[PDB]
Curated annotation (Swiss-Prot), chain A:
GO biological process: L-cysteine catabolic process to hypotaurine; L-cysteine catabolic process to taurine; taurine biosynthetic process; taurine metabolic process
Top-level taxonomy: Eukaryota, Metazoa, Chordata, Craniata, Vertebrata
Protein EC: 4.1.1.29, 4.1.1.11
Pathway as given in its UniProt record: Organosulfur biosynthesis; taurine biosynthesis; hypotaurine from L-cysteine: step 2/2
Record PANTHER family: CYSTEINE SULFINIC ACID DECARBOXYLASE, GLUTAMATE DECARBOXYLASE-RELATED
Record-given protein name: Cysteine sulfinic acid decarboxylase
Length: 478, 476
């Protein structure tokens, strides 16, 4: 109240959103970003909060400004991250979620979503290969990884929950040198310390070497630490590599270790009958992290933690020593499953898109991203100046743009240094033009290279031809 | 293609406006649509399938999901520490979701990096600080864990690398009335729950400084290292406010990090009239404050504020050959401040509402909630069958409904056990009828915890809810 005013405000806001954020925001005819230096953007935004409010017209103008100067992450030429694109059904679900404004904490205040989340989690477990189990959604896959670490410690040393880490021996966990940095950040957060993380060599394709895993386990034991968890990666953030899960599982079983699979990125490939062999062996995991907000475009945040456990380990680990006077089955309440209290609804946006697309529609999208990745690799191999870092296993395509001044100069002593300066210059230019955005980074001894990501559901070959031609134009003088 | 997307989303928004926003804030509609779980399971037809569905089937699912969800903006929704729908905050939420980015780098969120900075700058200003640091968190429970982690790292930075076995045993202190995230957090961080020393609270639900200082001296005598005190400004059950100036005096004498869990009560800082409740907060090292509670910003909107200006936050949470020579000043990026990687934008919804209302409009709302709390107290005291648990100092009003069968029977030896059965029955009846939702809490006999927070609340709703408890409890 006033409801007329409320409806008119929201419809007028929503009109700006549809026109400026959704239509213009996903159009190749518009810019991916409107670069402004920080200090200049602050002036343009006029951010200082004040005692006096503003008019309806001033507010709507501010809505336009925020949109105008924001990055268009649904644009066909946005390649900067491991998510890209705007699924309309997911967005409808997001909008519904934000209007209902509840906490996913008890059946009492979130009955539709408590049941919806169970069912989504059940289907995700099925695609992993489990007909039973547990799990919960988390605010980001980094938190999912920490849940797994905490559960592994609890399962082996449940006295830790009450007595803390001084009642325990030193603990060691194991992960690939290509691991997401949430493993070490989590270890530090959980009190283990980053030193508890034993890094395992990866092979030329970026995949953990099971033989170096075993060596590392034995060495950690000889040094007086107690191995308790192995974390493999099914889809590394840079190369997009997939650890060999059946062989890592073998090492875990021989040593009695908890087997966690960080599939935040690659787990969505389980919807593709064609490409899900990349995760063969994942059904042997004790836990799996999986982020549908990446490859499936569900929207941040959409991160699930799946468990094979069927013994209420999740509630026993995180539940409060304190629901015995209610009129419904309290097993439906999920507060004891998490360290949060309030928790956003993150299942609707995925569930609604999934209902609209079908399993077939999402499989088709994944298969179309793998097919477009093949087109990008072919164009890179047929064009002068483009050099692949390694053959892609996923939708990460890593490559250099070799500018004319360096072609043939590989044997020169400063070739890797000179080449490392190319991507940063191209990034600045494409960003300041607004034509596209592509992530780049160095890697081991490798000079700065681009990491292209083929994921946007509306991507087309014409966009790959455009990005390659745009790099040639932007790097001609380098 | 674009015409079908616009058509779809406009169709969906029509339903959202009709069912969620207009019906969901109408006193004539129910607050919840109770269904036994198994009936709702079957009604919803949740099972995911190979084939997709038509636009028509999808729009039906949108209306169904809204129909059966609780209307947390309804005037008679009192179940939580949040209630109501601010349309500007909602407008900000809807923009955020359509821009779908990560509050991570200026490069992919240039507007929101600068926006969060200003918002946090203002929040610190209301705490009483003209400098500092901070970040937004996915819930106040995590805000509290950050504070625990920061205090640990600030005293024992070797912990980040070597972990807790390289440290002495550690002790933190909170009130008996504190939020359970303190104890879940301690376990999560490897401290163990035994590290949390519970301090007695007084008759009004407030930490007793004398018992805090005692527990601190004891922990030392047992060989532990006291390192943190966590106070609460606005407890979840009684809405008490710990005496922050006296607690600060204690932390100061023993060199302890002083954290104020103001998730609930922090918003009172916007009120010149009522902010005295948080006197002494300016002396804290850290403050948790949830605008999604009393300011109605939308879940999640939970700030962690630090007086620190030395990048303690980045040293604590930061991830540590050829140089990635980004072309702008990466000091602007906030990825190292948090243990997440991806992070939602949560500042727009708050900022847009603040621009619309001004600090003056938000202060108006807070003062109006306090005044309506006085009204509710008055009506409880003037009505037969209602007994206040204690005098409220915030917007939480804790009270029993004594049904006719127990009026006068206080001295019976089993009066309490019979009184404690009343609220669970009234709760079941009000949920299944759908006219209102009020939480009750065991803490003596199960009492109700009313919460006066919804911005559209009026006297008529307080009259209604008292009348409704009488109706629902006349046969008890
Ligand atoms: Cl990403
Ligand atoms: Cl959340
Ligand atoms: Cl399916
Ligand atoms: Cl709450
Ligand atoms: Cl988040
Ligand atoms: Cl203000
Ligand atoms: Co080539
Ligand atoms: Co009375």
């Amino acid at each position: 109240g006033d409801p007329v005013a409320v409806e008119a405000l929201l419809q007028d806001v929503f009109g700006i959103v549809v026109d400026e954020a959704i239509l213009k925001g996903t159009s190749a005819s518009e810019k991916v970003c409107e670069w402004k230096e920080p200090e200049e953007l602050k002036q343009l935004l006029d951010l200082e909060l004040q005692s006096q409010g503003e008019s309806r017209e001033q507010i709507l103008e501010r809505c336009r400004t925020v949109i105008h100067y924001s990055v268009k992450t649904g644009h066909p030429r946005f390649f900067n991250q491991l998510f890209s694109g705007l699924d309309p059904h997911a967005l409808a679900g997001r909008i519904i979620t934000e209007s209902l404004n509840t906490s996913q904490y008890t059946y009492e205040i979130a009955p539709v979503f408590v049941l919806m989340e169970e069912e989504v989690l059940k289907k995700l477990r099925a695609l992993v290969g489990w007909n039973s189990g547990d799990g919960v959604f988390c605010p980001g896959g980094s938190i999912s990884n920490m849940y797994a670490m905490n559960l592994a410690r609890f399962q082996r040393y449940p006295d830790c929950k009450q007595r803390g880490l001084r009642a325990l021996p030193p603990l060691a966990l194991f992960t690939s040198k290509e691991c997401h940095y949430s493993i070490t950040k989590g270890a530090a957060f959980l009190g283990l310390g980053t030193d508890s993380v034993r890094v395992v060599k990866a092979d030329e394709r970026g995949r953990m070497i099971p033989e170096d895993l075993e060596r590392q386990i034995i060495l950690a034991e000889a040094e007086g630490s107690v191995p308790f968890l192995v974390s493999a990666t099914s889809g590394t953030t840079v190369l997009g590599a997939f650890d060999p899960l059946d062989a890592i599982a073998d090492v875990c079983q021989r040593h009695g270790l908890w087997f966690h699979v960080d599939a935040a990125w690659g787990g969505s490939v389980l919807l593709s009958r064609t490409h899900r062999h990349l995760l063969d062996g994942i059904q042997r995991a004790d836990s799996v992290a999986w982020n549908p907000h990446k490859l499936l475009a569900a929207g941040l945040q959409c991160s699930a933690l799946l468990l094979r456990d069927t013994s209420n380990l999740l509630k026993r680990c995180h539940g409060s020593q304190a629901q015995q006077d209610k009129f419904y089955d309290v097993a439906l309440d999920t507060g004891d499953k998490v360290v949060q209290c309030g928790r956003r609804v993150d299942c609707l946006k995925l569930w609604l898109m999934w209902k609209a697309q079908g399993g077939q529609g999402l499989e088709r999208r994944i298969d179309q991203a793998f097919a477009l990745t093949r087109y990008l690799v072919e164009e890179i191999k047929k064009r002068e100046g483009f050099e692949l870092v390694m053959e892609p296993e996923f939708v990460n395509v890593c490559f250099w743009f070799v500018p004319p001044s360096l072609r043939g100069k590989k044997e020169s002593p400063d070739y890797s240094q000179r080449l490392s300066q190319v991507a940063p210059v191209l990034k600045e230019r494409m960003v300041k033009k607004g034509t596209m955005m592509i992530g780049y980074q160095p890697h081991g001894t490798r000079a700065n290279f681009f990491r292209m990501v083929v994921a946007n559901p509306i991507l087309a070959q014409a966009d790959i031809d455009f990005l390659l031609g745009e790099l040639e134009l932007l790097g001609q003088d380098l």
